[PDB]
Amino acid sequence: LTEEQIAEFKEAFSLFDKDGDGTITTKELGTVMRSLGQNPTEAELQDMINEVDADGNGTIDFPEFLTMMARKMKDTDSEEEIREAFRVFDKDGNGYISAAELRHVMTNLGEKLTDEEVDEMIREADIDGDGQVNYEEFVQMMTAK
């Protein structure tokens, strides 16, 4: 939204628009992606351009780049908030919330649950059935429908 945000987003855009013509080609995108230690396929590059290319003209302009960037920033903010909450649940940092971690967290907060109840909570959220709650499960359990 801000003139300041748009200047910052114009700054990011320029790194992609290697020749300064106001558009990003699949090539340019590739150059940038390689310079970041990535080797995307030609098909991956086209997909990424296709996903941003609102007008379908084959390249991405700054207006299209602003739309994409403003969404990516809302997504990232959201991922960083859910993630900081997952790190709090996951005491020993192994990437999984256990029944004992969940119980301890509710209890330090105040709300005491039994092992029975905590096990039910883990089972509800444990999509892949590994007895624990990974990040993807934790995000889904905040959503479900």
Least distance to Ca ion, CB of residue 140, Å: 10
Our finding on whether 17 is near Ca ion (CB under 5 A) is yes
Q: Which of residues 25-84 bind Ca ion (CB under 5 A)?
A: 53, 55, 57
> How many residues make up the chain in this entry?
145
Our finding on whether 122 is near Ca ion (CB under 5 A) is no
Long-range pairs for 53-58: beta carbons < 8 A, 24 or more residues apart: 58/25
For residue 145, the number of C-alpha atoms closer than 13 Å in the C-beta half-sphere is 0
Give the count of residues interacting with Ca ion (CB under 5 A).
15
- Residue 94 assigned ligand-binding role: yes
The alpha carbon torsion through 121, 125, 129, 131 (nearest 10 deg) reads -40
- Please give the annotated binding residues, written as ranges: 17, 19, 21, 23, 28, 53, 55, 57, 59, 64, 90, 92, 94, 96, 101, 126, 128, 130, 132, 137
